Structure formats: structure tokens, C-alpha cells
RNA sequence: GGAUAGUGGCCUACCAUGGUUUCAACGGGUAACGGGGAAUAAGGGUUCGAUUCCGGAGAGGGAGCCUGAGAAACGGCUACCACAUCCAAGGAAGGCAGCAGGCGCGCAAAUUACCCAAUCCUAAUUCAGGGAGGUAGUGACAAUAAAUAACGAUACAGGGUCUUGUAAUUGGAAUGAGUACAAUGUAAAUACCUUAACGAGGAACAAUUGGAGGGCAAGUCUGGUGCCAGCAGCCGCGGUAAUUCCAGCUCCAAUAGCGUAUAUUAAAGUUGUUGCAGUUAAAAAGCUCGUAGUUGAACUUUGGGCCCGGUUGGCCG
């Protein structure tokens, strides 16, 4: 579990996009900073500052599917709820 | 390039003589947006 | 979209659901296959 | 070619040709490794301890606790009386049973001060005026009644976008239910997974009816830290408890504010906002639990900053001129490959605009500006300030007892209240089908200002000129871009969208949510202008074309523009055949009567400035 | 000799100079309590074992001791150290790694409930007591069993006078999820078992989680958005390092379960004792001597004869 500290543009290409962008988080307890992963666009307005993200590693890659070198930790919940659910519009994340 | 990698490996397959589904328009697209 | 308060005490007609979707299966697989081209296609679509 | 030397470590003669072109190691021994993990935990529980020295509740502090309660059918008031009853004193409810909403409890059981606010119910926005101040908020729910579709839930909503600090459910009116257990438990579960949909973090709402219970959420509204808002604790606030006017001129006087401190901390120069009041300079300030006054370096109440002055189809009207309309246009041809200056001189632009901060870079003067309110700050969060402001006679009508309804006062940063173009993000509101404009008035709540805006809306794609399409109408699906003028915001705050109506029992009707994003003035919101007409004539090479024009004038100077088509066929005029705007033209194909006769021309928008709202 | 309940360098006085080690002593690390055991299965193995049983140790850190058969005891005392409580400012009281509970930590863990009815234990003792233990609450850790429909008639499509599918066609039967008299249950209740009464015609009492170049099971599917100095020009087609940009349809697998992350095991003969490899792909010391280590030619009562009593198949019954 981390912090946020702020988002990247770590984007695909300019403007002509496949918008794969994602974080600088710093975990907790060891008080490391560590480079997430966060699914397709549309999830980058819940995640704000400080929020205090769930994130798990990524692992597995093929040749498509997310080819994105230097990155191992998708995040998977925010702020306390999910990234699944808050996407697919089960839930609502509270601000801050 | 995705579409190129998935074109070039599947002729590959012809002279290697194995069975493979003919095409049509989601080939290179992503099945499944993520989560 | 959001849950009801006291919830908790096109439309096509559902599908049946265990033992009976195995019988809408055991009957669509193979008992009276309806589309035979030879091989046994499974998903076509325009034909 | 040749067959290449092998080896797993280079060869020296193979590094010679690429080179020529300190802290020991050490291995931990267990004292050493027992020793630092307790090192880091001794200072891990200092840290817990220092930063819970706000709430050691017998002299200084102070746990801000609002109870909201759902449901027209629920009093705050029996809530409050079922939760004291759990701390084995009696005369603390006899005290405030008369009138009283601001209730100074202390707790000798658990060793706590708490600050009880209750907020009016005919006003929706002093619902939430009230709760984002507080550190708790207490969701009243029911269980004989549904929650109210559009007056319950717009209030959950209204609170969930704008910041809310930690949170507790209770339920007190579980015995109007079947008296069996496995039916209050039937209906407590749907309020469960109800309150788990809008608060998904607790999994359990507490009844009021076991004092075990009672006592567990007594136990938690003092003793577990609250949870931070970013916004509202970079900034400072107070809350008042006694306000006195006194008399130093014959148009303004000083408000003597008798309250406690939270947040990050004051300071005597800085500027101050009270909510539907307005912003103000600091005058005096005085501790008890020295005096600081504002010195020389006081920033001056005024909206503009005086120093920055040194530094689409459209049907076309016969009796409309196409000349005088048309002249702050440009003819490029691709939105991302043109180029557009920021100062250029239009008539159409505001006067004013020559007096606007031109603000470079955005997150460094923000990280710039909390770290100089860390060390600048004479009133330290967590004390009793004596707070002496300047305030305009005038208004002493609409201030009231602190005691019934609540009194904040907001700290402000450096150049809060000079203006800069801003940009805001915009999400349509759910069950919102109802379109609206561009240009309509929109009051804004963000931070904790309010104000009117009428913001042009945009698309948030991005650019490499930073030139984007404008839409007249809000994209009913996407996020949108709105840029406006507006007081600039430092934190990132998130802002709402509503606009008043009296049809409703709230004055209010939420449009959407957002978030503070930019002050950016090199994003320029560009517009495309079509003009139709009907192709008349058709020949071998020559089309005539009708109702494109009605002036012999307008064909000639619009000769050098290329010709295109809604159909994708591109083309050039020829002549002017008729006075009523009939005209040839060539075209590389061939074209029919449902066609239409099209234009791409490109212009500028110049945003409307704020004004702050009050009533 | 002293000391102990008692042997003994356990300690003391004197006198000897020994004791362990390349068969790894001694030192160091262990995110090490040991074991019965756990997962993994073609064999051998690899990994794990804080945790329902046995043994050891500790009750914030050390030390000292009273009482007693038994204690270096902490729900005993004394002192020191580190925390910390009360106040009338003189003084007093501490120890949840017992049961509930709370703070802190973290990815990560429940009620400040009922009772001694069972199992056993303690006492002066059938009787008192027991947060030992049991009952219940929370509990998708893990495991067992299997609801979400079955049948008939009419009209079409068949295989072809007897057999299946289709339909906004139709008909009555059956039942538990629920509610609930009562009774069983229980220390008393809840729940299960039994059951008077109510309780099914689909948007009812509506099952999800993933997946479709191969793995691999499942598309010669659709719509919309943005770009093309590409063809054509009423439409469109194609590309689109948009690594498909956003949605939908269809199909497949498992199923009250399903996916992801980390660790580990199989696949794996990539730890190779069974069972790898070293010319050219990782890898034969530059060469020889040589101690430990490992390994070491063949050879000494073989053969024949006698009878005895057994366990297996049968010609036999």
C-alpha cells in the first residue's frame, strides 16, 4: 500500500495515442518509490493525489496486451475501494 | 505494431502446415478493454 | 445504478441454469446437429 | 567474415580498447540488525505519538463532529441524546435541551473534547458548509423510511465529490421495525450493502440500539485519528465560538473571533475568506492558550493585480454582411499543424487581459507555495487564537450567533485573490440528461469559493500547438475541458457545478463535479465556422451555387480560400455569375443536388470574467 | 575438602599439560523453538512445519529470594533499567505473549455475548468454583451434499407409416428458498430434523467470474470517434508503431463459485544418487609430483551318495 505522489505521461507515442499512462507512488513501509500501472483511460480521473493506493505486481507479459518496460506494479485499488468495481461503475470513490 | 506481429507469425504457419482460423477484422484489436 | 435502500428484503428470456443448461447443451452439441457443412462449424455469422 | 573470440569475461586486451577510450562491505550482525529494527520502530511510535498530540482531549483539542442525518423523519437532536447516554453522565443533555446547536462535550470516560455541529435542514448549502469544516461526519440513517431519491442521496453525493474526512452510520430508529431480531437484521444488512455502495470502506452501520454498539461508535468518534483533506489542510481554518464588533471608523470596524486554529497554520500578512461573505486582509492577532500584527507586506484587496500591467453550420442572413463578421479569422487547414499567438490584438479581447498573472508552471509555484506557509506561519494549527480582521460595517446584518449556525474562517495563500485563466475538469452528473450551453451562468463551488462563472467548454485531448475544437454544447458522455477566468487555486481543489432554481427544495441544481487542473493562458480554445449553400446549377465543369452568399462583394474577397464539401470533394471557385450570390465553381468530381456547398474557417474565444455569489 | 537432594572442575587449595579439529574444530548467519507431521505423486525426491498432540523456554529487560513436597513463580515479593498512573505536592500503585477490547503496525486476522448442562480439574469436598472448557455472534481460511425447473397437448421443420427440434401457442401438476401455529432441540435460547397455514408463471423467487494468432475452447461479427499529401470521387475501399481509441453482438470454459498477486511443487533429466553436461553452443586446471579423501587382480569345502519329513500343481474323487 502506497502513496501517490503524482502522474506521469508516460505515453504511448504523441498525440496520435494509445493511452497507457500511469504514476509515481512511494510504498509505506519502507519508504521506497516504485513506478505503478494503471488499466485503460477513464481511470485516471479517480486516481488524484494522495490517495493512498492498494498495488500488486504485474508480472506476466506478452508481445500485446501492455508491453511497457520498467513497470511491474499494477495498481490494483484506490483510496480504499477497488479499480474493477469503480470502474465498471459498482462503487464511487470519496475525495480524499 | 501489434497487427504486424500477428500477420507475420500467421503465413509462418502455412509452410509449417498446421491449422489456423481465417481473419476479419479484430485482429488487432484489444478483446477485452481492461479493468 | 445505485442499489436501492430497502431493495433488500434487448430482453430476451433468460437461459436455464445448471443441470438444465446441460441439457440445452447435450441437445445443441450433438443429437440433431443443425448447421452441417462437414466439419462441424460452431459460431457462424452473416452464414 | 571471421569467427569471433568467445569468453564470458572480457579479455584485457578486448578492455583496453573500450576503458581507455571507497565503503567497505559489511555483514550484519544480529545485535546490529536487533538493534535497528528497534531504532526504526522507536521512531515509527514517536511519530504515532507526536502526530496524535492534537487529541489529547483535556485542554488543547478539539474533534470537529458534524451529525447529517438522512431523512426528513430523523432528529439529530434524539441521535446525539442515545450516543451521550453512553457515557454515564446525565446533566450534559439537560444543558443544551433548550436551544443549542454547538455543543462543547467533554468526555471524562475516554478523555476527549468534542465539537458537536448540527446544520440547518431548509438550507442545502449550510449542509454543506457545515460538514466539510469537521473531521467526522456522522450519516444519520432510517429504518422505517426510504431515503429520498433527489433530496437523501444529492446530499451523500454532494459530500462525496467535494472532500469528506472519516465516517460513521448509526441507525436509530431500528425499533419501528418487526421487533424479531431476524427482521431487524434483514433491513440493517440493505442498509449495509446501501451505505457500502456510496462509502465503500465500512462494511458495517452501527444500531443505536445496543449500548455496546453506542459505545462502539463513542469509542471511535474520539479516539480514531480523522482523516485528511488535502485541500482544506493546506490551507488553515477556524472555527469561531464568539465574534464581537468594535467601532474604529465610521465605515468599518474589527471582528474579535474567539477560536481554536487547525490546519497548517496562520499568518498576520495573509488574506482570509469567510464563506458566503467574502475575502478580506488580516488586521490583529493574539495568542493565548504573543501579539502578531499585518506588517508592510500586506497583500491589497483588489481582483486585478495592478503590477501585471507592466508585463457548426451556420445559415447566412441576406441583410448579415459577410465582411464586418469575418475578419478576426484565419484560413489554416489542420487543428494540430498551425500555429497562434497569445498576444495577439483583437477588439474581441477583454481590456483587462493586459492585467492578468502570466503564470509559467503550475505544480512548481504550488510545490513553491506550501513550503512557504510550512516555515511563515506565526499561528501554529492546534491553539486559541484571538482573531482580530478588518470587515466592512455593512454586513453585520447576515452575521449571526455562532452558536446556531456555524462561522468559518478559511486561511488563504499568496495571490489567492488575483485572477488567472484557469481550466477546469468537468463530469456530467448522474441522471443528467438536460443540455446546457456554453455561456450560461454556472455558480462554482471550489475549495471553498464560490462563484458565478460562464466557462467555454472544450475537449481535453491533447495537442502539440495546445489549440483544441470547441463544442457549444456539454459532451454528454466524456470529460470536458471549461476555461474561464476565475481566482487562482493552489491545491488542486475539487470543484462542483449547480446553478440555483427555487422549484426544488434546494436551491440549488448540480450540473456535474471536478477538479481544480491548471492556470494555464497558452491554451487557446479555437472555433470552427461553416457556412452552407445550396448548389443551384450543375454543367460539365461549372457549379452555381445559391444561398452561399448575396453580395457580388463577398464572392470576390472569399476567392483565395480553398473550396471543400461535407461529402469529402475538394474544389475552387470561378467566377460570379449573379448579384443574389450565384457563382461558379470547379469541382474534381461530380456533384448532385443533396449536396452542400461548405466552408472551413477558424476564429478566437475570450472568456468572461468571475463574480463571487451570494443568497 | 566445601557445596548439593545427589554424581561431577560445580566451586576452592595444590599438582600435572592437557582437550577438539580437513571425518570441517572454533568463529559467523539463521526473516531457527525441536518433533509427531503438511503440500506436491510414475519412482527417488523438493519445499514447509508460529498453529488443536508431546517436549523446551518466557511472562517489558536483567538479577535476587520468601513460602512450600514441588517455584529462581511474575493474575508472589525486593532492587536496578526502560515506560507509565493518581493526586490535597507529603506519598501511593504498576505489568492482557489469560478471555473479551482498544491504540500502533501492516497486504493480513472476530463479541468489552451466555453457562458450568457436557469433558475434566481443584478444595475441608457428591453440593462451591473454573474467560480451562462448552453454547452462540462475526466468519466465501479450508472441506462435504446439491435449487435456479420437469411433464403434456396444438401448428411448422425434419429423420421418415414412428422419432426429434422450433413457437412473444397452450394446459394443468410437483417442490423448497421464505414467512410460521406447534413440537423436537438447548443450562436457557438460535439453528438443524418433523410439520397445521401462506408461499412460481418469467422485466417471477431473474448466477456470476473470466476468456476467443497458437497455448486453447471459442468469430470469412457490428456500430461510432481521430489521422492519411494512399486509390476512387453519388458512395466508399485500404492503411492507422490509435502496440486498436471507445462500445456492442456472437461463441467457449468453470460454476455458488470465479479471477488476480506473491511463495512453493509438478511439468523439469535447469541440481541430475536413480538421472545432466564440458571438441565446435556455459564449462577439462599450462604441465607433472603428492597428503587427506575415494577406489583397489585372482586365490583357501567344490562335488557326489543316503534316507527323512514338508507346500504347490495335477492322473485320480
Known amino acids: 500500500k502506497g502513496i501517490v505522489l503524482e502522474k506521469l505521461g508516460i505515453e504511448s507515442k504523441q498525440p496520435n495515442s494509445a493511452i497507457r499512462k500511469c504514476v509515481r507512488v512511494q510504498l509505506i513501509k519502507n519508504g521506497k518509490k516504485v513506478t505503478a500501472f494503471v488499466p485503460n483511460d477513464g481511470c485516471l480521473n479517480f486516481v488524484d493525489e494522495n490517495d ?4 500488486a505486481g504485474f508480472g506476466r507479459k506478452g508481445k500485446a496486451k501492455g508491453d511497457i518496460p520498467g513497470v511491474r506494479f499494477k495498481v490494483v485499488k484506490v483510496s480504499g475501494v477497488s479499480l474493477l468495481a469503480l470502474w465498471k461503475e459498482k462503487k464511487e470513490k470519496p475525495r480524499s | 505494431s501489434a497487427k504486424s506481429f500477428i500477420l507475420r507469425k500467421k503465413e509462418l504457419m502455412k509452410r509449417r502446415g498446421r491449422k489456423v482460423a481465417k481473419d476479419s477484422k479484430f485482429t488487432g484489436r484489444k478483446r477485452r478493454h481492461r479493468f | 445504478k445505485v442499489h436501492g435502500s430497502l431493495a433488500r428484503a434487448t430482453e430476451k428470456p433468460k437461459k436455464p441454469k445448471g443441470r438444465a443448461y446441460k441439457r440445452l447443451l447435450y441437445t445443441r452439441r450433438f443429437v440433431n446437429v443443425t448447421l452441417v457443412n462437414g466439419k462441424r462449424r460452431m459460431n457462424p455469422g452473416p452464414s | 567474415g571471421h569467427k569471433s573470440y568467445k569468453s564470458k569475461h572480457a579479455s584485457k586486451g578486448a578492455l583496453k580498447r573500450l576503458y581507455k577510450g571507497g565503503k567497505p562491505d559489511k555483514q550484519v550482525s544480529k545485535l546490529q540488525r536487533k538493534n535497528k529494527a528497534k531504532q526504526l520502530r522507536a521512531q515509527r511510535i514517536l511519530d504515532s505519538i507526536e502526530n496524535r498530540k492534537l487529541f489529547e482531549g483535556k485542554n488543547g483539542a478539539a474533534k470537529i463532529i458534524t451529525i447529517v442525518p438522512l431523512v426528513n423523519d430523523l432528529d439529530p437532536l434524539d441521535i446525539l441524546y442515545k450516543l451521550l447516554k453512553c457515557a454515564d453522565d446525565e446533566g450534559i443533555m439537560v444543558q443544551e435541551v433548550d436551544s443549542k446547536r454547538i455543543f462543547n462535550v467533554h468526555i471524562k470516560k475516554f478523555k476527549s473534547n468534542l465539537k458537536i455541529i448540527i446544520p440547518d435542514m431548509t438550507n442545502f ?9 469537521a473531521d467526522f461526519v456522522v450519516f444519520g440513517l432510517s429504518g422505517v423510511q426510504e431515503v ?11 459530500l462525496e465529490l467535494q472532500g469528506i474526512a472519516s465516517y460513521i452510520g448509526v441507525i436509530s430508529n431500528l425499533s419501528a421495525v418487526h421487533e424479531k431480531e431476524k427482521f431487524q437484521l434483514d433491513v440493517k444488512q440493505s442498509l449495509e450493502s446501501y451505505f457500502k455502495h456510496f462509502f465503500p470502506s465500512e462494511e458495517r452501520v452501527y444500531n443505536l440500539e445496543k449500548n455496546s454498539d453506542a459505545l462502539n461508535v463513542l469509542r471511535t468518534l474520539c479516539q480514531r485519528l480523522p482523516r485528511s483533506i488535502n485541500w482544506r489542510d493546506n490551507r488553515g481554518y477556524v472555527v469561531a465560538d464568539f465574534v464581537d464588533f468594535v467601532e474604529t471608523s465610521p465605515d468599518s470596524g474589527d471582528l474579535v473571533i474567539e477560536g481554536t486554529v487547525r490546519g497548517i497554520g496562520f499568518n498576520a500578512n495573509r488574506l482570509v475568506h469567510i464563506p458566503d461573505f467574502g475575502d478580506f486582509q488580516l488586521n490583529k492577532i493574539e495568542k493565548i492558550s504573543t501579539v502578531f500584527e499585518s506588517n508592510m507586506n500586506r497583500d491589497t484587496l483588489d481582483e486585478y493585480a495592478p503590477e501585471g500591467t507592466e508585463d457548426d453550420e451556420i445559415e447566412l442572413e441576406p441583410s448579415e454582411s459577410a465582411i464586418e463578421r469575418l475578419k478576426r479569422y484565419r484560413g489554416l487547414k489542420n487543428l494540430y499543424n498551425c500555429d497562434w499567438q497569445v498576444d495577439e490584438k483583437d477588439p474581441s479581447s477583454p481590456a483587462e487581459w493586459k492585467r492578468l498573472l502570466r503564470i509559467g508552471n503550475y505544480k512548481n509555484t504550488k510545490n513553491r507555495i506550501i513550503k512557504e506557509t510550512k516555515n511563515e506561519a506565526q499561528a501554529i494549527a492546534g491553539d486559541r487564537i484571538r482573531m482580530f480582521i478588518r470587515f466592512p460595517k455593512f454586513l453585520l446584518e447576515k452575521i449571526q450567533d455562532p452558536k446556531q449556525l ?10 489567492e485573490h488575483k485572477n488567472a ?14 443540455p446546457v450551453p456554453s455561456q450560461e451562468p454556472i455558480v462554482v463551488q471550489y475549495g471553498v469559493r464560490r462563484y458565478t462563472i460562464q466557462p467555454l467548454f472544450s475537449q481535453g485531448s491533447n495537442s502539440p500547438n495546445n489549440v483544441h475544437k470547441y ?3 456539454l459532451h454528454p458522455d466524456t470529460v470536458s475541458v471549461a476555461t474561464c477566468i476565475a481566482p487562482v487555486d493552489f491545491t488542486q481543489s475539487p470543484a462542483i457545478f449547480f446553478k440555483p432554481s ?28 461553416i457556412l452552407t449553400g445550396h448548389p443551384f446549377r450543375f454543367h460539365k465543369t461549372v457549379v452555381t451555387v445559391r444561398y452561399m452568399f448575396f453580395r457580388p462583394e463577398d464572392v470576390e474577397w472569399f476567392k483565395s480560400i480553398p473550396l471543400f464539401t461535407k461529402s469529402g470533394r475538394s474544389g475552387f471557385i470561378k467566377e460570379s455569375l449573379g448579384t443574389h450570390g450565384y457563382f461558379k465553381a470547379t469541382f474534381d468530381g461530380k456533384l448532385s443536388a443533396q449536396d452542400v456547398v461548405a466552408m472551413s474557417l477558424y476564429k478566437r474565444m475570450w472568456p468572461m470574467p468571475s463574480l463571487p455569489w451570494n443568497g
Open chain 1, 52 to 55: 493512498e493506493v492498494l498495488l
Open chain 4, 125 to 133: 448549502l449550510n449542509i454543506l458548509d457545515c460538514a466539510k469544516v
Open chain 4, 148 to 158: 429520498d431519491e433527489e433530496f437523501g442521496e444529492q446530499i451523500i453525493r454532494a
Open chain 4, 406 to 415: 456555524l462561522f468559518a474562517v478559511y486561511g488563504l495563500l499568496l495571490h
Open chain 4, 421 to 434: 485563466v484557469v481550466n477546469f475538469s468537468l463530469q456530467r452528473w448522474e441522471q443528467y440528461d438536460k
Open chain 4, 471 to 473: 463544442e457549444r454544447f
Open chain 4, 502 to 529: 427555487p422549484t426544488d427544495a434546494k436551491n440549488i441544481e448540480l450540473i456535474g463535479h471536478g477538479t481544480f487542473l491548471n492556470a494555464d493562458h497558452s491554451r487557446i480554445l479555437a472555433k470552427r465556422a
